Specification:
This is part of a larger assembly, with one copy of chain A and three copies of chain B. Chain A has two helices and twelve strands. Chain A is mostly beta strands. Chain A has one domain. Chain B has one domain (about 1-234). The longest helix of chain B is centred in the middle third of the chain and has 6 residues, at about 100-105. Classes of the chains: A mainly beta, B mainly beta. The PDB classes it as virus.
């Protein structure tokens, strides 16, 4: 017989849709900083980072779902009557042009994937393939990007998965509107190699493995005690 | 043209759905897979691996490697207890942070047999006997050598073998039990004192290992109670 | 009548989709195709074509046709370097604006072998030898004739042949490399001086050609960094 | 891409629909079914079971077990009526709260034959006769022993048998009738007095049972008129 190990599998263990980032962007602003952005990383949410770092090399597709909700703000503008709000979620592949302004040329997205979503419909969804000149993402890198520089330890350009950019296509009304994107992340077709011990010490930095040393477990009163 | 209905539950984002997602980078060729050694397809492969159990969990020792070393005294009362911990791989702090316990804390239900290995790290000329006694759940930990012997036990003779593998059976009323907080007890007893060529000074140690057997399973995935973040790390 | 769900990602305009579009002019007969010579189906056909490499990229020469002419001095120290450029078809300005480099700059990743042809444009009675040396990536450009000879090289004898085709191999740790900014080096060295019926005045020239081999590919299409517009041209 | 219409009735929540619902806990293994004795698949199995009928529904007796006991007097006029109730399993309070009546009150229409069992709980030496008379709907309950005898009846002789099963036929103009408020009447009559070895003091009792026959059915499910709540119990 034997009990089923179906949901213990790496696919079921890791292919779980979780929120990894949320940002708010305005509809009007002083500068062009009316856009949200997120460099796609797996080392910013502790639960997902621990689950992925239980293995050494992984290879998966990124399924991203965006939950965009808009809120009208304060007051002092009357007769708002805003039409429906359209959002653009532009994905910038590795090595692609990166916007610095809400109306940058990169938003014209000649080759950057972009999804335009009107509010009230189902949340937008896009899937990023395995994008790496290497053969697998490496959660751990015991080496230097440049051996000359000490600060390049553990950094390799093979784990860069691109950047997501979010903005308002139309303002709708002359009054303030702030939208939250709430990106939901879900690996698909996951293959993992070289399993590793779970991270014991709490994480400190996203780009580091540094740790304050911690006890192996919780203490008890006596070696023969039971409670 | 083809008629279609509302079918309640549409235009919703159920987080735990398996719908196909449009590809943002179609017509892009991913690099072929490389034959990397160490393909793991199930977390039980991690859980099947022996991991050293910190039994010496006394205060002040969890920050040192002495937490893994069970001290075996050079002279002690016969029938004394060498150590003892409950069979709570996901609850008891002795087994909680092991590889098995780390896997278990990612789930809500579990079932299977716990495999315990005790290895004697004393001298090759050292000899002696131990009572590795197992108490079924609800019985209560034995208080003397005799109570341990009258139950399930093995006489682990140090001279004959330096290791003892003890397979803990599955005793519960349900197919699965909750990982969180009965389970049983392991207690070791000094059947005989450790005998050496009478010239040594320091004491021996016992190392413990925990593992899952082939009938081990976990049901309901959840968040581990060990890693915690206030916000995004960057 | 038939039930249907929301299927998140509907009513969206993904720019990189392949959905059928309704025809604004149906029931309209397009003119039949005509057998025009020159059917091209792939940009590599353009990239497979030899293009003259401007190696004489010195200041003041990029605006003249002399940028394509490698000067071969009538008298110079033996073991001097005739020219040298890195193997960066999409990065180095020597190979950047060639047909191969122009194709490469439209993409993000590339792989394959670079085919280099050096043609001597001197007199038929002229004779001489050159060291066409290739340095693998990370080695560094040679500084003397001896270092070039101790590596990968060919003795290009001008008298025997007026052209030399040099196939640069593919040496990288990944299947593809980024077009943008190691790659290697080509250096030519005066093995012997150019020998002529001792009555000439002006110097000889070398023309360089670049091409892709049959194993050449490009992965991720992007915008070329060469054409730029402030707005619509009309 | 595929055309689809509005099909009126979409995006509506009809409470009595049978549409598939997305699973909030997919990839979760439920525990296997266990062979529990008592698998019931239909409420008629409950309705087929004999249940004791409270016929002694007089005021002050519904709160005691005497409501189930039909008193048989030691001495009474011959041709007196022992008891009598109408054949309204879902309406008459005599049969309303029985298992059959409890099932019936959950529905609006019903059809079938009522099975009535009368058991004599007197002494083994006691003897006597009863007229278990049945009146068809619309006839009216008989007023004398003779009227009961001239209709449908059985002579239930206590000495010969201590039980009498009486199957009430299905007499209605429609396939089903409403559970709520003719049906008929059961009346028992003293054919002869109860005869005993002439030394006893207390009186005998008759217990009544009601059941459904194999041709019993209920059509339109509704809310039972018995349980009532002002709001949620918690």
């Amino acid at each position: 017989n034997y009990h089923s190990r179906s949901e213990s599998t790496v696919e079921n263990f890791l292919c779980r849709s979780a929120c990894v980032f949320y940002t708010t962007y305005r509809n009007h602003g002083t500068d062009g900083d009316n856009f949200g952005y997120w460099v796609i990383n797996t080392r910013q949410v502790a639960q997902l980072r621990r689950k992925l770092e239980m293995f050494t090399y992984a290879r998966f597709d990124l399924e991203l779902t965006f939950v965009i909700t808009s809120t009208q703000e304060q007051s002092t503008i009357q007769g708002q009557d805003s039409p429906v709000l359209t959002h653009q979620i532009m994905y910038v592949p590795p090595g692609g042009p990166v916007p610095t302004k809400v109306n940058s040329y990169s938003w014209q997205t000649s080759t950057n994937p972009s999804v335009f979503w009107t509010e009230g419909s189902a949340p937008p969804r896009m899937s990023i393939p395995f994008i790496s000149i290497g053969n697998a993402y490496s959660m751990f890198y015991d080496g230097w990007a440049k051996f000359d520089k000490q600060g390049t330890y553990g950094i390799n350009t093979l784990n860069n998965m691109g950047t997501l950019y979010m903005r308002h296509v139309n303002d709708g009304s002359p009054g303030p509107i702030v939208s939250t994107v709430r990106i939901y992340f879900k690996p698909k077709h996951v293959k993992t190699w070289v399993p590793r011990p779970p991270r014991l010490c709490q994480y400190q930095k996203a780009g580091n493995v540094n740790f304050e040393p911690t006890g192996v477990t919780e203490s008890r009163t006596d070696i023969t005690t039971m409670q | 043209g083809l008629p279609t209905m509302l079918t309640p539950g549409s235009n919703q984002f159920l987080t735990s759905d398996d719908f196909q997602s449009p590809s943002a980078m179609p017509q892009f060729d991913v690099t072929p897979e490389m034959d990397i050694p160490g393909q793991v397809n199930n977390l039980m492969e991690i859980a099947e691996v022996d991991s050293v159990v910190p039994v010496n969990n006394t205060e002040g020792k969890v920050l040192s490697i002495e937490s893994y070393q069970i001290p075996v005294q050079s002279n002690s009362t016969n029938g004394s207890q060498v150590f003892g911990f409950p069979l709570m791989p996901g609850a008891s702090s002795v087994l909680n942070r092991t590889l098995l316990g780390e896997i278990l804390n990612y789930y809500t239900h579990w079932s299977g047999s716990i495999k315990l290995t005790f290895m004697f790290c004393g001298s090759a000329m050292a000899t002696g006997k131990f009572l590795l006694a197992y108490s079924p759940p609800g019985a209560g930990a034995p208080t003397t050598r005799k109570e341990a012997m009258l139950g399930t036990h093995v006489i682990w003779d140090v001279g004959l073998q330096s290791s003892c593998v003890l397979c803990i059976p599955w005793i519960s009323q349900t197919h699965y039990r909750y990982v969180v907080v009965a389970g049983g007890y392991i207690t070791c007893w000094y059947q005989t004192n450790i005998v050496v060529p009478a010239d040594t000074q320091s004491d021996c140690k016992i190392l413990c290992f925990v593992s899952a057997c082939n009938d081990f399973s976990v049901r309901m995935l959840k968040d581990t109670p060990f890693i915690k973040q206030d916000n995004f790390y960057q």
